[PDB]
Design an enzyme around this catalytic site. Structure first.
Site, PDB file in Angstrom:
ATOM      1  N   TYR A   5       0.835  -1.194   0.000  1.00 29.94           N
ATOM      2  CA  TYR A   5       0.000   0.000   0.000  1.00 29.94           C
ATOM      3  C   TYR A   5       0.874   1.250   0.000  1.00 29.94           C
ATOM      4  O   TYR A   5       0.596   2.244   0.674  1.00 29.94           O
ATOM      5  CB  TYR A   5      -0.960  -0.044   1.190  1.00 29.94           C
TER       6      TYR A   5
ATOM      7  N   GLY B 260       7.083  -0.801  10.218  1.00 30.76           N
ATOM      8  CA  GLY B 260       5.805  -0.381   9.670  1.00 30.76           C
ATOM      9  C   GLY B 260       5.363  -1.315   8.577  1.00 30.76           C
ATOM     10  O   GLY B 260       5.149  -0.874   7.453  1.00 30.76           O
ATOM     11  N   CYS B 261       5.215  -2.602   8.886  1.00 31.79           N
ATOM     12  CA  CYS B 261       5.271  -3.619   7.836  1.00 31.79           C
ATOM     13  C   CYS B 261       3.959  -3.791   7.073  1.00 31.79           C
ATOM     14  O   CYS B 261       3.932  -4.567   6.109  1.00 31.79           O
ATOM     15  CB  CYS B 261       5.722  -4.964   8.437  1.00 31.79           C
TER      16      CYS B 261
ATOM     17  N   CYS C 274      -4.295  12.774  -4.584  1.00 31.97           N
ATOM     18  CA  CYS C 274      -2.883  12.538  -4.351  1.00 31.97           C
ATOM     19  C   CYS C 274      -2.164  12.325  -5.674  1.00 31.97           C
ATOM     20  O   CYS C 274      -1.043  12.806  -5.862  1.00 31.97           O
ATOM     21  CB  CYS C 274      -2.669  11.327  -3.451  1.00 31.97           C
TER      22      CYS C 274
HETATM   23  N1  LIG Z   1       5.801   3.833  15.408  1.00 31.57           N
HETATM   24  C1  LIG Z   1       5.542   2.835  14.563  1.00 31.57           C
HETATM   25  N2  LIG Z   1       6.175   1.627  14.710  1.00 31.57           N
HETATM   26  C2  LIG Z   1       5.935   0.554  13.881  1.00 31.57           C
HETATM   27  N3  LIG Z   1       5.035   0.684  12.860  1.00 31.57           N
HETATM   28  C3  LIG Z   1       4.418   1.875  12.701  1.00 31.57           C
HETATM   29  C4  LIG Z   1       4.646   2.970  13.522  1.00 31.57           C
HETATM   30  N4  LIG Z   1       3.851   3.988  13.101  1.00 31.57           N
HETATM   31  C5  LIG Z   1       3.153   3.557  12.016  1.00 31.57           C
HETATM   32  N5  LIG Z   1       3.492   2.255  11.779  1.00 31.57           N
HETATM   33  C6  LIG Z   1       3.029   1.340  10.731  1.00 31.57           C
HETATM   34  O1  LIG Z   1       3.535   1.708   9.469  1.00 31.57           O
HETATM   35  C7  LIG Z   1       2.675   1.218   8.446  1.00 31.57           C
HETATM   36  C8  LIG Z   1       2.372   2.357   7.477  1.00 31.57           C
HETATM   37  S1  LIG Z   1       1.380   1.891   6.035  1.00 31.57           S
HETATM   38  C9  LIG Z   1       2.764   1.200   5.068  1.00 31.57           C
HETATM   39  C10 LIG Z   1       2.662  -0.323   5.067  1.00 31.57           C
HETATM   40  C11 LIG Z   1       3.734  -1.137   4.319  1.00 31.57           C
HETATM   41  N6  LIG Z   1       5.071  -0.702   4.729  1.00 31.57           N
HETATM   42  C12 LIG Z   1       3.594  -1.029   2.816  1.00 31.57           C
HETATM   43  O2  LIG Z   1       4.581  -0.780   2.100  1.00 31.57           O
HETATM   44  O3  LIG Z   1       2.496  -1.252   2.308  1.00 31.57           O
HETATM   45  C13 LIG Z   1       1.437   0.683   9.170  1.00 31.57           C
HETATM   46  O4  LIG Z   1       1.554  -0.722   9.297  1.00 31.57           O
HETATM   47  C14 LIG Z   1       1.529   1.321  10.543  1.00 31.57           C
HETATM   48  O5  LIG Z   1       0.883   0.580  11.574  1.00 31.57           O
END
Ligand SMILES: Nc1ncnc2c1ncn2[C@@H]1O[C@H](CSCC[C@H](N)C(=O)O)[C@@H](O)[C@H]1O
EC number: 2.1.1.-
Length: 271
Positions: free
Chosen positions: A17, A56-57, A253
């Site tokens: 995403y 932030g997976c 966007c």
């Molecule tokens: N402090 C934090 N520690 C770990 N994950 C975090 C965070 N703040 C936001 N996130 C996570 O970061 C992600 C952003 S959305 C991006 C998702 C994924 N990396 C992709 O490429 O699709 C979400 O899963 C959110 O929960």
């Protein structure tokens, strides 16, 4: 929040995403998302058996790709329970002898040593008061030759925009407010100095910056085209209000990436 069943209508099977990478003009969305993941992971010089952290997976696509293609141990952190659950399930369904774990945990609470770090569009969800702290923590958990690939959105101020021939319109201001007022990313983006200056203060070298601005425009166009094609199903899963809000976000966007008001880049970060 928003059900996985809604996102399933416009994301590709990786569930990624974030900005894709159309490394060849004719890749599908899924090929371009894998290409974006590989573009980042190739910059980390992964050898089989190292341990990769994904800060932030999301729904786990990069972690899965890392295991399948690079044969690394993986740890993924997320604050979203839906992201965690799907990452957990997907990683457990990979046949691997490596360790592959997803966690409902912030990077702020993570202190284990890892060999390499990747992060795709999590940094914009961090508070600005944590930017330096994030790089300090990342530096601390990496080895002496560790590397981090930070893939992040960032914004431009009026002065820089103008020197590039670009103006923020009244519409753009309302759109920014719409992003902040609803549940969408992009309302509180870092500047490029927010990334670069804090990373360098923590001890990192910025080895390479790869801008992907127009790839994000194309990615957002594809998400919007997919969502429109599934409009009835999206309304059934959520509502017409949510559907129209998402289409406003996706198309708005996309327009602003094409116009150059904001950017997205992969920063190769070394010690
Ligand atoms: N402090 C934090 N520690 C770990 N994950 C975090 C965070 N703040 C936001 N996130 C996570 O970061 C992600 C952003 S959305 C991006 C998702 C994924 N990396 C992709 O490429 O699709 C979400 O899963 C959110 O929960």
């Amino acid at each position: 929040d928003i059900s996985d069943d809604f996102f399933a209508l416009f994301l590709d099977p990786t569930w990624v995403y974030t900005c894709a990478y159309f490394e060849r003009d004719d890749m599908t969305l899924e090929e371009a998302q894998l290409a974006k993941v590989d573009l980042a992971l190739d910059k980390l010089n992964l050898e089989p058996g190292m341990t990769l952290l994904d800060v932030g997976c999301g729904w786990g696509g990069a972690l899965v790709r890392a295991v399948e293609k690079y044969d690394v141990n993986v740890i993924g952190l997320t604050l979203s329970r839906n992201h965690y659950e799907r990452s957990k399930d997907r990683l457990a369904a990979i046949g691997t002898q490596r360790r592959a774990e997803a966690r409902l945990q912030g990077w702020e609470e993570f202190e284990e040593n890892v060999d390499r770090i990747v992060s795709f569009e999590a940094f914009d969800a961090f508070k600005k008061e944590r930017y330096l702290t994030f790089f300090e923590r990342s530096y601390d958990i990496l080895p002496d030759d560790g590397r981090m690939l930070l893939h992040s959105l960032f914004t431009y101020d009026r002065r820089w925009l103008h020197e590039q021939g670009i103006a923020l319109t009244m519409s753009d201001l309302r759109f920014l407010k719409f992003l902040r007022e609803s549940i969408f990313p992009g309302g509180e983006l870092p500047s490029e100095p927010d990334i670069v200056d804090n990373a360098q203060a923590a001890g990192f070298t910025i080895e390479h910056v790869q801008l992907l601005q127009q790839h994000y425009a194309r990615t957002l166009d594809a998400w919007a085209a997919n969502l429109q094609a599934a409009r009835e199903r999206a309304i059934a899963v959520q509502s017409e209000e949510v559907y129209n809000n998402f289409m406003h976000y996706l198309t708005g966007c996309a327009e602003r990436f094409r116009r150059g008001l904001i950017n997205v880049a992969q920063f190769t970060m070394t010690k």
